[PDB]
Amino acid sequence: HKILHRLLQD
Amino acid sequence: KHKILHRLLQD
Amino acid sequence: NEDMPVERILEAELAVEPNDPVTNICQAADKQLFTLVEWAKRIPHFSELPLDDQVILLRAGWNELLIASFSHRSIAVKDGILLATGLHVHRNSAHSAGVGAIFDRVLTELVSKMRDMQMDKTELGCLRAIVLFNPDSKGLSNPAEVEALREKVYASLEAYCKHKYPEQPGRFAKLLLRLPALRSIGLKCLEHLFFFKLIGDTPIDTFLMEMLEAP
């Protein structure tokens, strides 16, 4: 859920 | 126009 | 208890009480609906609303209501449910007939959640009441009355929650909060039924086919 993840990481 | 339920709401 | 009495709602609860699993769960529903109307009669001020407004409210909540009835009746059984019909439907049985997804949702979402808090029949008859007085129901001639009457059923339930269960402050909120899930499950419960009829594989008896037949 590539985008969601990317936003949550940083 | 849904008979049985109206019939059941008289008694 | 001045205008909405906790007991009386609870009276109605006590008062109404009892190969192809799917076929069975249906035989049970048409049978349950008959008894449901009477339950409804038994709730303070329901019958004081014009029949038409009553029929929209009953048509509006037949799934949510009978659902939470059978959920509570099932706080006893391990994995499965007990029908009004007196059969048991186990999780394996339901899964084998293609309806497991919903089945676990009832069991996870409602039955364990209910069972965990040891919800009483009063608290059940009370929630069922807030369902029935859904002022958001379509075609409802006086929305003001139904709306307040829910304001009654709930000021009444909160008060009771404090009395019987003062140790747990958050009881009131937790109970209201299974209502969205109740909503969610009922709608998904409806779909399945349209599909059974659409197929015509599953015999559906008259009262049911009625509540599936459009306005």
Added chain:
Amino acid sequence: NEDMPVERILEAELAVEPNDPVTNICQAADKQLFTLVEWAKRIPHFSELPLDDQVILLRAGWNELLIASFSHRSIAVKDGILLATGLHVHRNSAHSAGVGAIFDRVLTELVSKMRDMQMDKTELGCLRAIVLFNPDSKGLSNPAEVEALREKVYASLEAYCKHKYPEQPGRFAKLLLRLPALRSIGLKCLEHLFFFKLIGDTPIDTFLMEMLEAP
């Protein structure tokens, strides 16, 4: 109101606060899923969670969290919503576009009610905070840890509700009895987006597109 406070639950609300319309809404809707994440980073303890959980919670609650955020926005607008993209969208624009049925439902069922009780930004964040913390969500690693957080939130609200509007006893339950609608609206609301994807003539962006993806 120390572990989980309204005061911040307000900050996390102040900080994110902002040609065929079924497109204008959907864009607005994509743009929003981004800021939604910034909000969830500020509703306390969401982050502390396993990131695997922050994903499940958000995929399952984006529909309702978003609908609720706009409806609040649109208290001023008479008969239409206030989208984050700046445009104002009237009910007829909606009707002419084949979506008269659900748009009316958001207005009647959610906005009018918001306006009628003059529901505040804190009250909203809290209702959103509750929505975010759904224990029923499948695949949640510690569904109880969530169950907890909704429980702290919904307490901090009552403390508010009881405080700030002391003349208003039924407010807390009133506030929470809009959620089953929120859910109800969200399901059908969702039902379309899949349709607009299926028939293929409505533009749908990357983020919005990710959410309409099979778990």
